[PDB]
């Protein structure tokens, strides 16, 4: 079918430009109508532009005309959106979307999105601390342990446990914005309490804006 992968989140300065990529697999790019739709945090969907197969032309939305460029590399099945003269109102998740060009549909498939943050503040990778299991985090046959992902910027951070081999009973919480203007979040996993002496637990933290990954071993409190 169609699968889409996008470039990673990043912070850009006001007045700068951003270039977001979208790599397509399953269908060749020539068979697809590519579009870009953004969503500012807590707001609705805004179409930026995309391919009109009836005229065979890429058309931009009025509000971005003169600031946006959409291009493609069909040798690599990759589409690109570049947005210039960035401002606060451009902080948003940018989705590539596509529909088969044989249809008029623009968004049968949505990419995973790329969060672009427009700010004068610089990128900061996280400091990761273990949240060790103890008698005060146990619930009989299960126990809670976690990771504290401190003082990063911009969003997002993702967390997995044991490389994704633990999924049931993972909960990664939304981040807090601290007085410093930096974010923190936590992730917890519930595991068997009998296990804790012998099993290895690792939180896998990904901060794409800083090109940082941290695998933090979480050991029982001693």
């Amino acid at each position: 079918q169609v699968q889409l992968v996008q470039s990673g989140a990043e912070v850009k300065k006001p007045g700068a430009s951003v270039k977001v990529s979208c790599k397509v697999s399953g269908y060749m790019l020539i068979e697809l109508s590519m579009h870009w739709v953004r969503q500012a945090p807590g707001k609705g969907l805004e179409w930026m532009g995309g391919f009109d197969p009836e005229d065979a032309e890429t058309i931009y939305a009025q509000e971005f005309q003169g600031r946006v460029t959409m291009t493609e590399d069909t040798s690599t099945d990759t589409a690109y959106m570049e947005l210039s003269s960035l401002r606060s109102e451009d902080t948003a998740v940018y989705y590539c979307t596509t529909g088969p060009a044989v249809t008029n549909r623009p968004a049968d498939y949505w990419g995973p999105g790329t969060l672009v943050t427009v700010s004068s503040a610089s990128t900061k990778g996280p400091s990761v601390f273990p949240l060790a299991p103890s008698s005060k985090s146990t619930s009989g046959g299960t126990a809670a342990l976690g990771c504290l992902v401190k003082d990063y910027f911009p969003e997002p951070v993702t967390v997995s446990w044991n490389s994704g081999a633990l999924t049931s009973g993972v909960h990664t919480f939304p981040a807090v914005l601290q007085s410093s203007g930096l974010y923190s979040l936590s992730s917890v996993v519930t595991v068997p309490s009998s296990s804790l002496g012998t099993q290895t637990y690792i939180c896998n933290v990904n901060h794409k804006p800083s090109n940082t990954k941290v695998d933090k071993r979480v050991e029982p409190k001693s």
């Binding site: 969907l45 995309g50 989705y95 400091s127 917890v188």
Partner: protein, 218 residues
């Protein structure tokens, strides 16, 4: 704001039928351009729900249907289920200047009558690694509560404390309950100089309090 207009919110009880309208103009829906609908579940990307006014993509249940008449379109959900809590967006095309894709402003759907659920609260003390870095953070994690309103208070020993507390707004989980977290920032000397700290979570008149103490290695 939006070129297409939707209600901000709709609600119904499980098993009932609810409708979401989408009104446009003679340059979009009234020009006979198709209307598609997208569902955005809490924490996810939008996904196609209805296409070409009334058709279901593979995988969408037959409880979802759509229609169009004149300048308006409507999404109907029968047999409403708690998993249908989501934001719903209509989409069409508008020829006022050139080709364009236009969206509705979205509708938040609430499923009424969901049972109250008390919070699960876990409180972690500062890690040894963080203390050795001359910092200290208490972490209060609050999950699986319903409805979404929760109050969080902290105590140092028995006395209320506000300095250093930073708390997130409740956020809808994928299971329709809510999560929040609260962080108390202290110096290592403050952490070591009290007998205990507590996080108190109040939800629908009842309170869950967890405590940690620097003299525990538990």
């Amino acid at each position: 704001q939006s070129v297409l207009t939707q209600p901000p919110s709709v609600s119904g009880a499980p098993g009932q039928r609810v409708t979401i309208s989408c009104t446009g103009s003679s340059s979009n829906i009234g020009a006979s351009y198709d209307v598609h609908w997208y569902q955005q579940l809490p924490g996810t990307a939008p996904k196609l729900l209805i296409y070409a006014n009334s058709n279901r993509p593979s995988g969408v249940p037959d409880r979802f249907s759509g229609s169009k008449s004149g300048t308006s379109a409507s999404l109907a959900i029968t047999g409403l289920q708690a998993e249908d809590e989501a934001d719903y967006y209509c989409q069409s095309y508008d020829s006022s200047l050139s080709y364009s894709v236009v969206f509705g402003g979205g509708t938040k759907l609430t499923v009424l009558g969901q049972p109250k659920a008390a919070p699960s609260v876990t409180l972690f003390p500062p890690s040894s690694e963080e203390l050795q870095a001359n910092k200290a953070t208490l972490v209060c994690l609050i999950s699986d509560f319903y409805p979404g309103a929760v109050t969080v208070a902290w105590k140092a020993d028995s006395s209320p404390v506000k300095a250093g507390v930073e708390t997130t707004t409740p956020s809808k989980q994928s299971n329709n309950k809510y999560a929040a977290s609260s962080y108390l920032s202290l110096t290592p000397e403050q952490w070591k100089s009290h007998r205990s700290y507590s996080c108190q979570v109040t939800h629908e008149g009842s309170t869950v309090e967890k405590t940690v103490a620097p003299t525990e290695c538990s």
